[PDB]
Amino acid sequence: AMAPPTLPPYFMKGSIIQLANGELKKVEDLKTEDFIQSAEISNDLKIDSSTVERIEDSHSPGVAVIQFAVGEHRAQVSVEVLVEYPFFVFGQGWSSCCPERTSQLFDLPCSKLSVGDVCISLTLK
Amino acid sequence: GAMAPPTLPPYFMKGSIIQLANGELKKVEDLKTEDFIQSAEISNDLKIDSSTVERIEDSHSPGVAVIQFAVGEHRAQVSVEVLVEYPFFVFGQGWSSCCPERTSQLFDLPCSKLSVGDVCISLTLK
Ligand code: NA
């Protein structure tokens, strides 16, 4: 199970995120709550949360194999992702497997993605 | 099917403003191919990685497309299942997806039909 080979451009710090209420916030100052109400005021989106179960090296160098427990019912999904890929962890902010690279790439301060981290995202319905 | 975070579209970049390496600021919808190359010349540790669309189909799951990529210089084979509205930025083309119409109403921006041979770019390390 592979991840898209592209990264969204809004990760380069200094980028401004528009919340569904109208207020603006720099990508690095983004707080957990900013995800919640944004999805609570959107009749298109809701919040989906996935828990990190395991992090393994992949046969491809610089790429990690993360096993996730997705949403309620904890569906198990393993996905190969770049080590630098930034996840927003519940109550911890931006996290990746290699914050050092995420700093070299986006100048974005990251925590160390760890087992049990609840990575939240905006999804549909 | 069930999708991990990275597989999901970055809906959060709707109406966003990107901070380029050159210090410039651009609304996401106004990004140009040159903006990528121009901000990749700033550092030497940075470069524009390329993934070429080799094949596009429909998955066993509805609303999900099966895209085949040649990733990077060594053209690694990569098959990805994503929601049909997943925005990719294409060399000389800009935002594109398997369902441009759906991408426009969800990310608020013009979107072209993703087609075999499109080179999807992004900023990468090393
Ligand atoms: Na460079």
From Swiss-Prot, chain B:
Cell location: Cytoplasm; Nucleus
Induction cue: ATXN1 protein levels are directly regulated by PUM1 protein: PUM1 acts by binding to the 3'-UTR of ATXN1 mRNA, affecting ATXN1 mRNA stability and leading to reduced ATXN1 protein levels.
Impact upon substituting residue 47 to R: Sumoylation reduced to 43% of wild-type
Residues in AXH domain copies: 4-126
Cross-link (Glycyl lysine isopeptide (Lys-Gly) (interchain with G-Cter in SUMO)): 47
PTM (free text): Ubiquitinated by UBE3A, leading to its degradation by the proteasome. The presence of expanded poly-Gln repeats in spinocerebellar ataxia 1 (SCA1) patients impairs ubiquitination and degradation, leading to accumulation of ATXN1 in neurons and subsequent toxicity.
Tissue distribution: Widely expressed throughout the body.
Disease implication from the record: Spinocerebellar ataxia 1: Spinocerebellar ataxia is a clinically and genetically heterogeneous group of cerebellar disorders. Patients show progressive incoordination of gait and often poor coordination of hands, speech and eye movements, due to cerebellum degeneration with variable involvement of the brainstem and spinal cord.
Functional description taken from the UniProt entry: Chromatin-binding factor that repress Notch signaling in the absence of Notch intracellular domain by acting as a CBF1 corepressor. Binds to the HEY promoter and might assist, along with NCOR2, RBPJ-mediated repression. Binds RNA in vitro. May be involved in RNA metabolism. In concert with CIC and ATXN1L, involved in brain development.
Protein family per UniProt: Belongs to the ATXN1 family.
Subunit structure and binding partners: Homooligomer. Interacts with CIC. Interacts with ANP32A, PQBP1, UBQLN4, ATXN1L and USP7. Directly interacts with RBPJ; this interaction is disrupted in the presence of Notch intracellular domain. Competes with ATXN1L for RBPJ-binding. Found in a complex with CIC and ATXN1L.
Notes concerning its domains: The AXH domain is required for interaction with CIC.
Leftover remarks: Self-association seems to be necessary for formation of nuclear aggregates which are associated with pathogenesis.
Protein name, UniProt field: Ataxin-1
Organism expressing this protein natively: Homo sapiens
Residues shown, of full length: 566 to 688 of 815
